[PDB]
Amino acid sequence: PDLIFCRKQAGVAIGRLCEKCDGKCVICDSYVRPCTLVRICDECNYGSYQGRCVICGGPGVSDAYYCKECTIQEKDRDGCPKIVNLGSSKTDL
Amino acid sequence: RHMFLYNLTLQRATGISFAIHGNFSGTKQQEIVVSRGKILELLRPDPNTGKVHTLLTVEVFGVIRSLMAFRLTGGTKDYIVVGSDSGRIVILEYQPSKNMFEKIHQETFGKSGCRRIVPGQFLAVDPKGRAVMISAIEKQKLVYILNRDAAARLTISSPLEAHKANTLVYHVVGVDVGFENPMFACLEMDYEEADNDPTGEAAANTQQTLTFYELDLGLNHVVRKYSEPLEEHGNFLITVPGGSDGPSGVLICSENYITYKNFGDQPDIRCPIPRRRNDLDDPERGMIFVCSATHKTKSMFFFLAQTEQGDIFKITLETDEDMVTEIRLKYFDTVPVAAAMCVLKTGFLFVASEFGNHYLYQIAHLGDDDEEPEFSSAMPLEEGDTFFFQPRPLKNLVLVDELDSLSPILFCQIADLANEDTPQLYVACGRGPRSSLRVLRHGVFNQVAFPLQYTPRKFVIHPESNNLIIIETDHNAYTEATKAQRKQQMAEEMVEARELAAEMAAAFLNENLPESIFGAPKAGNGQWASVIRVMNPIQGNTLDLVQLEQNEAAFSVAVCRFSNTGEDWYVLVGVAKDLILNPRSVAGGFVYTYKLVNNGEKLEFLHKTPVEEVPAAIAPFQGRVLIGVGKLLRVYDLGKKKLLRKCENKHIANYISGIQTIGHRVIVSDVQESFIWVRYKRNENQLIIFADDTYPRWVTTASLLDYDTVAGADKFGNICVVRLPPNTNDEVDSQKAEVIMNYHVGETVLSLQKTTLIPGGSESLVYTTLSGGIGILVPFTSHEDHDFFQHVEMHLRSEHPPLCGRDHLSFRSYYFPVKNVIDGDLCEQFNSMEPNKQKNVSEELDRTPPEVSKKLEDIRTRY
Amino acid sequence: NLPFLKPDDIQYFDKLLVDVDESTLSPEEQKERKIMKLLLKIKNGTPPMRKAALRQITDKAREFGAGPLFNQILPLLMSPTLEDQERHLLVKVIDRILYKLDDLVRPYVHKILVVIEPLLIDEDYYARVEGREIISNLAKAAGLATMISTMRPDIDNMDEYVRNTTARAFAVVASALGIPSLLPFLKAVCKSKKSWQARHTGIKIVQQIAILMGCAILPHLRSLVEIIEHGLVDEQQKVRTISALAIAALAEAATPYGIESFDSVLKPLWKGIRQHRGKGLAAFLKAIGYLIPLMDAEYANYYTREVMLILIREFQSPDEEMKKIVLKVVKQCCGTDGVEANYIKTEILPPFFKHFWQHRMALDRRNYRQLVDTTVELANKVGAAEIISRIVDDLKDEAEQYRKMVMETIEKIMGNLGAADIDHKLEEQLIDGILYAFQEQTTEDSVMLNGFGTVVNALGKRVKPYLPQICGTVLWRLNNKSAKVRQQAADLISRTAVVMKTCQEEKLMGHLGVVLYEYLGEEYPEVLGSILGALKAIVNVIGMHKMTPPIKDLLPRLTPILKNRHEKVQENCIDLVGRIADRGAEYVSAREWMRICFELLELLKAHKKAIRRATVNTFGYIAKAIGPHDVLATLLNNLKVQERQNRVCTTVAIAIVAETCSPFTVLPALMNEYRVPELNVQNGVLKSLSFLFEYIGEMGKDYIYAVTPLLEDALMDRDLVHRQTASAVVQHMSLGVYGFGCEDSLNHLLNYVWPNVFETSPHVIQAVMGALEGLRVAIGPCRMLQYCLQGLFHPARKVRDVYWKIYNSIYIGSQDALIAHYPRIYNDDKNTYIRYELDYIL
Amino acid sequence: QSKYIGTGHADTTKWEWLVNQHRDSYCSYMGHFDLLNYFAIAENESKARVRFNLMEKMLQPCGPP
Ligand SMILES: CC(=O)O[C@@H](C)/C=C\C(=O)N[C@@H]1C[C@H](C)[C@H](C/C=C(C)/C=C/[C@@H]2CC(C)=CC(=O)O2)O[C@@H]1C
Ligand SMILES: [Zn+2]
Numbered sequence A: 001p002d003l004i005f006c007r008k009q010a011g012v013a014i015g016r017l018c019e020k021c022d023g024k025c026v027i028c029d030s031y032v033r034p035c036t037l038v039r040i041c042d043e044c045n046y047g048s049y050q051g052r053c054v055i056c057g058g059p060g061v062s063d064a065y066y067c068k069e070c071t072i073q074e075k076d077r078d079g080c081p082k083i084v085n086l087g088s089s090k091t092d093l
Numbered sequence B: 001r002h003m004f005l006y007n008l009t010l011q012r013a014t015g016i017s018f019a020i021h022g023n024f025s026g027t028k029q030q031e032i033v034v035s036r037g038k039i040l041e042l043l044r045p046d047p048n049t050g051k052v053h054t055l056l057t058v059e060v061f062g063v064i065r066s067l068m069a070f071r072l073t074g075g076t077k078d079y080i081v082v083g084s085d086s087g088r089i090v091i092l093e094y095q096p097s098k099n100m101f102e103k104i105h106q107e108t109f110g111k112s113g114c115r116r117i118v119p120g121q122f123l124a125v126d127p128k129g130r131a132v133m134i135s136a137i138e139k140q141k142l143v144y145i146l147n148r149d150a151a152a153r154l155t156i157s158s159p160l161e162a163h164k165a166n167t168l169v170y171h172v173v174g175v176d177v178g179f180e181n182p183m184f185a186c187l188e189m190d191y192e193e194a195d196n197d198p199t200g201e202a203a204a205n206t207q208q209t210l211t212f213y214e215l216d217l218g219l220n221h222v223v224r225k226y227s228e229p230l231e232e233h234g235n236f237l238i239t240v241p242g243g244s245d246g247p248s249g250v251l252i253c254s255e256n257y258i259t260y261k262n263f264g265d266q267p268d269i270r271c272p273i274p275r276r277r278n279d280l281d282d283p284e285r286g287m288i289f290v291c292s293a294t295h296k297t298k299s300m301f302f303f304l305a306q307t308e309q310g311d312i313f314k315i316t317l318e319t320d321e322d323m324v325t326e327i328r329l330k331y332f333d334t335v336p337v338a339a340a341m342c343v344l345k346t347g348f349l350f351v352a353s354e355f356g357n358h359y360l361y362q363i364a365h366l367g368d369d370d371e372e373p374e375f376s377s378a379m380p381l382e383e384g385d386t387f388f389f390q391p392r393p394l395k396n397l398v399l400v401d402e403l404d405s406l407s408p409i410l411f412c413q414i415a416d417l418a419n420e421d422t423p424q425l426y427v428a429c430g431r432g433p434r435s436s437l438r439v440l441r442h443g444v445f446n447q448v449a450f451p452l453q454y455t456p457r458k459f460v461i462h463p464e465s466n467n468l469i470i471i472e473t474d475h476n477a478y479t480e481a482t483k484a485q486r487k488q489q490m491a492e493e494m495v496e497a498r499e500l501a502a503e504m505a506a507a508f509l510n511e512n513l514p515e516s517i518f519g520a521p522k523a524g525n526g527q528w529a530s531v532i533r534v535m536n537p538i539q540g541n542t543l544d545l546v547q548l549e550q551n552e553a554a555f556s557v558a559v560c561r562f563s564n565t566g567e568d569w570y571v572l573v574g575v576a577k578d579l580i581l582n583p584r585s586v587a588g589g590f591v592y593t594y595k596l597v598n599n600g601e602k603l604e605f606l607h608k609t610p611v612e613e614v615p616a617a618i619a620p621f622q623g624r625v626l627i628g629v630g631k632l633l634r635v636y637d638l639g640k641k642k643l644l645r646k647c648e649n650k651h652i653a654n655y656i657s658g659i660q661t662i663g664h665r666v667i668v669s670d671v672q673e674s675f676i677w678v679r680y681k682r683n684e685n686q687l688i689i690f691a692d693d694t695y696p697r698w699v700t701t702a703s704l705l706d707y708d709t710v711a712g713a714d715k716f717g718n719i720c721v722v723r724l725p726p727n728t729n730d731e732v733d734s735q736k737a738e739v740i741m742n743y744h745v746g747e748t749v750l751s752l753q754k755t756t757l758i759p760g761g762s763e764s765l766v767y768t769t770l771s772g773g774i775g776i777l778v779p780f781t782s783h784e785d786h787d788f789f790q791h792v793e794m795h796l797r798s799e800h801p802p803l804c805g806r807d808h809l810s811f812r813s814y815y816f817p818v819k820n821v822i823d824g825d826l827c828e829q830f831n832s833m834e835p836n837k838q839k840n841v842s843e844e845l846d847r848t849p850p851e852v853s854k855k856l857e858d859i860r861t862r863y
Numbered sequence C: 001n002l003p004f005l006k007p008d009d010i011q012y013f014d015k016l017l018v019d020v021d022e023s024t025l026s027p028e029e030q031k032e033r034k035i036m037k038l039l040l041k042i043k044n045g046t047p048p049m050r051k052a053a054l055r056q057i058t059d060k061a062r063e064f065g066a067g068p069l070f071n072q073i074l075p076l077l078m079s080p081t082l083e084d085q086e087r088h089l090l091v092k093v094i095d096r097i098l099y100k101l102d103d104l105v106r107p108y109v110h111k112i113l114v115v116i117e118p119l120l121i122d123e124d125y126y127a128r129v130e131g132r133e134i135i136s137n138l139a140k141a142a143g144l145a146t147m148i149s150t151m152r153p154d155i156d157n158m159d160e161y162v163r164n165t166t167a168r169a170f171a172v173v174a175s176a177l178g179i180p181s182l183l184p185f186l187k188a189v190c191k192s193k194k195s196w197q198a199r200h201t202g203i204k205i206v207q208q209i210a211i212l213m214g215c216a217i218l219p220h221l222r223s224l225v226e227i228i229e230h231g232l233v234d235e236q237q238k239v240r241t242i243s244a245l246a247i248a249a250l251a252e253a254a255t256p257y258g259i260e261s262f263d264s265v266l267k268p269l270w271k272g273i274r275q276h277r278g279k280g281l282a283a284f285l286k287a288i289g290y291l292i293p294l295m296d297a298e299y300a301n302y303y304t305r306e307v308m309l310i311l312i313r314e315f316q317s318p319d320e321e322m323k324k325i326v327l328k329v330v331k332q333c334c335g336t337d338g339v340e341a342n343y344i345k346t347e348i349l350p351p352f353f354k355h356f357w358q359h360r361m362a363l364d365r366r367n368y369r370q371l372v373d374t375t376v377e378l379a380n381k382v383g384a385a386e387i388i389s390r391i392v393d394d395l396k397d398e399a400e401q402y403r404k405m406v407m408e409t410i411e412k413i414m415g416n417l418g419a420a421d422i423d424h425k426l427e428e429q430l431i432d433g434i435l436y437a438f439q440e441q442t443t444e445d446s447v448m449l450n451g452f453g454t455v456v457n458a459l460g461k462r463v464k465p466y467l468p469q470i471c472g473t474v475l476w477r478l479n480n481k482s483a484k485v486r487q488q489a490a491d492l493i494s495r496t497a498v499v500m501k502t503c504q505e506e507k508l509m510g511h512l513g514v515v516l517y518e519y520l521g522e523e524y525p526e527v528l529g530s531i532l533g534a535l536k537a538i539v540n541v542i543g544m545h546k547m548t549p550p551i552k553d554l555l556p557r558l559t560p561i562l563k564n565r566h567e568k569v570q571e572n573c574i575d576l577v578g579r580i581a582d583r584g585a586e587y588v589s590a591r592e593w594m595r596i597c598f599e600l601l602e603l604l605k606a607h608k609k610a611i612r613r614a615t616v617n618t619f620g621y622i623a624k625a626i627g628p629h630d631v632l633a634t635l636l637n638n639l640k641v642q643e644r645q646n647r648v649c650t651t652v653a654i655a656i657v658a659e660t661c662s663p664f665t666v667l668p669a670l671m672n673e674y675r676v677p678e679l680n681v682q683n684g685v686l687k688s689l690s691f692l693f694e695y696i697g698e699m700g701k702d703y704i705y706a707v708t709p710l711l712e713d714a715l716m717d718r719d720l721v722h723r724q725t726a727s728a729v730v731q732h733m734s735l736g737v738y739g740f741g742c743e744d745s746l747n748h749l750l751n752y753v754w755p756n757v758f759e760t761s762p763h764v765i766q767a768v769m770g771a772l773e774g775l776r777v778a779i780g781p782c783r784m785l786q787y788c789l790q791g792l793f794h795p796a797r798k799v800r801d802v803y804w805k806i807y808n809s810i811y812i813g814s815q816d817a818l819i820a821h822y823p824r825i826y827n828d829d830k831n832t833y834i835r836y837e838l839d840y841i842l
Numbered sequence D: 001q002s003k004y005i006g007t008g009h010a011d012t013t014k015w016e017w018l019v020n021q022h023r024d025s026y027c028s029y030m031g032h033f034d035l036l037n038y039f040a041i042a043e044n045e046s047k048a049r050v051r052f053n054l055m056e057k058m059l060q061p062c063g064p065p
């Protein structure tokens, strides 16, 4: 209840994912069928957030993907899918 | 049992929705990119021969809503930006070596569909190519910034939001601010106040506004700088050249006016649109423009603006000291009403008509030398007085090419009327005076056109004589008698209130403007023109013709025989009286029973039968006729003085639009609910409803495949096949049909017919297209071929995705999920891929690429 | 409340800790207090706190005044303990308050710039970006004339560093307000007689404008060139150097358009080439090198022949910067149309290879990379053999770094071009040099491996006469105390396996395989993974039937290696096992396959994605090799005995069995396990079905009817989480069979999923909504519209709430489609509700 | 999801729902070429005239509240 999706207008920034969240789907946490490439807004990919995981926020190793089920329901067309915590500041670890 | 269909387009769509011109080859030659609907086409006009050639055509599997071209700074080739029905905007480049559209950029921003608030409908680019803007009809607007990299490859940025809630958009266009921060002019209207005023004051008090959106590059954001109301509601805008040549301001086209407006201290210079001398059109009707064009030169520039009546005017702006003081309008010759015009260098004009054939004209004289008057915004005029014009034949332009377009097809019958082996397609299409009945053969299609008076609605074939009985009905139109009467009235009040005016009125009367080129006299909300015609298929001759009253509109026709009276034929025509479309209101209808003698050449009037509503469907039925009047389905028998009803069913949902009979099963088509199966019990004379559908459908045409299966078409470009349960008793009701096939063609279908196009060969289901296309659905012979083509579809859906970002499976299931149809138009793009993709897909298919090509060609042979 | 404070925050937020009253504090003091509170809420605070504080500080920015605002902000922007995110928050609030105070900042412009300009030279890219952003916002807030008057006196300041900083800031304001707005000021300053430093600073401004804006300059390129062209013949030398550098930056920004704008710069540069020397000559050469690629072919040929003499002369300069500049210039010259290949081969290559290809050039890494890339670009136009022949004999030099350099160059050349350009003598030279370089590498280098592999693969079937020697070298290398060399040998085998198979030396490759076989007892994990990959390659090239050792002896040796922990070892071993199971499954009993299967099932919960992927592939191969019965039964038992975690692996295995073998095999027993009333195994079966359908996708178009009774039982209140998981099953079913004519069975299931829409548990209601959305995309929005229309308008408010939730989901999902599905709503006395347009009939 | 125009809550009125539905219909008409073509064939008006009449009707299509 403290974590929400950014939901801003996504831009040319390609989503990224760390070693733990490698094959996961950003929306439904599914592994089945990576379909379309994830885009994020410019604000979520700025500064130290460059190349940072979209789900948890760790060092990214592979591009992020929506899954086939979400692509079919056009859940890739929604806003920026980066998870943001409403109970922490920008300097909190 | 299971119906598995394969869809193939034989004759592509021929109507045009958008057209642009530019140097897409990258050379000094100019080409034209056109949007046929779901098809994107490239045309190269040869300046030597003065003929248009088609270079490339691509099925994009989407709905092109806005099309435009742009060029970067110092670039040598124009790109193509496409606004689609996906949530994506695409920028493409044509490579002439491969003859393909290379998708350079594709950016996602919203959901799919022709949505209300999702951008796609409007597209506007900065004249210097620095940025582009996509926009919806409401609220949301997006801006992308364009640039190049080290390798001179185009780059696009993230979107910049420029939304404004509770706001509509009539049109958007980029202002030529030279190299200042780019700016976009938008025609908007806020409905928030109108929605909260339960009296209706705010609805009329709200007014259209012209707003300017500026793009600060230094701060990198969009801002609403200025917004000025306008007294006259305007339909669209025109960008006039700015910076080094001309002022930046926009031109607004409105009802009866055209205004130049610019930001800053520039006053608004508005000039009333000229009218026509002694216009036959209704005095109350206004006048707007339909399209525009812009031609720049190192010296001057001008505009070409066409009106609803097809009048093209040349417009020049007279500017003094970075300020415009005068708008000057001169009559240019008249062409059919177009949707887009393209003034090319090398001196040619392209006219893509909104309906019917397209034209390529050659310029001869720009109109400067001739004595024809010229009209300016400063000339004194009383408020009600306007300028007045008299049209004349083509003097400035000469027709150098005519491109055939079958749009809009309203009816088609496929049969071998001319004694041949291969049958021909008889297509009632065209609109207004430009209507036509065309015979199409093949051995690509070959067409022969015979002109018609009014818009054809239906036509039937006489079995003994093989002659066509066509009905041509148009709304907002005059009949011959009323035309002559109104002309005489205008001459009579011309004399009253000198007396050279008698000679002038005699000259006006002795001059009959060809309605084909100068338009048909258009006047009246509820005025209708209707004509019954008999025509021989072989020759363009008309054997006989009947005219009906000024408020009588024909919508149904049939040629039949009666058991009441021998083997002599009869022709029944259904007519409505005082039909108002919006809001709907009709006085009644008539059924014209004609005898038709002289072996199918002359109609002999027998009698007129009054009826409560419009007779929208008439089909013969075993020595009787089945007539649909509103929600009432009646069986009528021929009488001496009248058509007398024998049985009537009243429980039809809304409105009968068509009925077809097989045995004693009648298949009523309703306007919103779909297909009601009724049974005529011969004993007791009762019509009993025994089936209907679980889904609503907007039925256009229909066709029966067997005693239990029906094929139908939507207004929304869908095709369906519905079949009744095998165990069905026509005396037990509440039986519901199952939908065994659903498909979306992307175009609206108005004729479905089961036929065998090639003698020998195989059966198929041929459909026509309101946008002027011909397609076929072929059933599969073996299920191994079905699996093969299904895998081909699956692989091409991911390896050759639609050009405009649409998902093919999503597209073909626009309103209903696809069921048992394969898209062969997509499959045939296998040969338009790259060698590596073809090789890998064929290896996955466990065969060779030429084997797959031959397998695809075998179906184009089996049709 | 009050957020947390770090120690450094005390210095800036001391006053906020004390408790006082507003009226006691002076009006000037109150402003300071609210600014402190707002900035503390911004800096250290949750995103809602930050948003509220931003809106409050922007809505009252004019009321506060720029004075206290910036006199409090700038101290924060100078703290040595300032986090990057803190800097970003500060630059954002600065932009937002600057947009509000238009001319209200003109007094403090100077006081701002002295704190901002040092950011334009920070090593951090984002610090420079933020500095440019705030200077742009300031130049937009304050007037252009205000910025000019504030920064004019520093043009001729004595410190060159201050001049550079001011020039960079002027470039930023030019990008912020536009080139034409600063055009006259720059035209004046570039011809300032009062100070050569002033003209130097103006030309520096133009150079930095180029460097910053790039391709957006082609507009005003003519104006900038006409403004700065006189600086090439100026009496001062430093201004000539900076004018050459500015011309170079402009050409770099204008690539490739706009050569005509430099029409009055050609002869000055051409004269200065012969006249000038030193750093000015280097700048002139750099400008010419960046200008050539824009010219036409014939004129490029002319100018290149004009300057090539001085270029070849400066080849032998002692200045390293001169060497780098002339090397870049040669690279730019020989990559353009007009400079013919024979011309370069005759006049340019001999001095290039005599002067540049020296030992000391292989020591510095910058010259290393520059020379390598330049030589490759040369080979791209002059021919690969013309380049390789001049450096191939150097493959046998004592200097290892020189061998590394020539090896990287040859590798890149032959990878970009191939081996068609090579004759026999050069091929022998290549093979000999590569053998000696690989045999004498003190440090294990990727360069030697890549070059060997690339040369072998490019020669292709032309390498057969050398294969015994290469394999002898590889064998001798596999016996060494160091491990990394053995790893390199195994990787070389892996990369050359396919070309060896093309050469038909199957006995050599069988010897390689049997040698690798005994090496499976290797202790170091990285080299073990390398030799596993090599065995996989060999097994791929020579079939399973003739592979030595035979599969029946190889696979049991591989079985215990699955217990290893190294990710490389696990990946390569699983891939080899999967190859064996795909093609050579007949040589292995079902017992060994089952044991591998149950040693492999754990690796489904590995952290690395590649390991899980390979595990899935291998499991599917072995499950297609064996019948599904044995594995299915033992997986069902494992599902019963294990609970929660480690049962997910069993469900994934069941789904993989369902995909490989038709679900006809797995579904009946999986559903019969649901027959027993043990509710936990019912949950397990439901989860298994959910993942099975989500995995098989369109494959389950023939099994909806079969699972329907189990669902309609589970949709009834068998538990609750049963309803949740059954809704999940229906959701995955619908999303998998989309567009395959399954509307009937899914429509039936909709009637048993619908009554559960009146549930309060958030997880189960979310699952029901997901199922309804999947059924919407599978059936169509029309049926959903009817089901929703039933209760859109209802007396019960809860009914309306639920049904409008449903309607909103549908409307967002497919608003365009619903146009064809809304019912007829007849107009009444007041409104006009009927869509008269759709009632039209032609 | 309230920001998405056209979504409704439990207090949505008949007028609001039908005005949104009519406006959606008009936008879809202008997007889908063949729908506008059918409309322009029904009423003998140009396509641009139909579009202008539609946009005029979008202010209060169903009528005043
Ligand atoms: C690419 C891909 O994943 O494909 C799929 C089809 C394959 C497998 C898959 O989904 N497999 C899934 C996915 C996931 C790997 C899942 C969760 C396992 C966890 C969270 C283990 C956590 C523990 C917690 C602690 C304290 C220490 C520790 O060491 O780990 O397991 C499950 C088996
Ligand atoms: Zn992560």
Ligand SMILES: [Zn+2]
Binding pocket: A006, A007, A008, A040, A041, A042, A043, A044, A080, A081, A082
């Ligand atoms: Zn974001």
Ligand SMILES: [Zn+2]
Binding pocket: A025, A026, A027, A028, A029, A030, A066, A067, A068, A069, A070
């Ligand atoms: Zn997902």
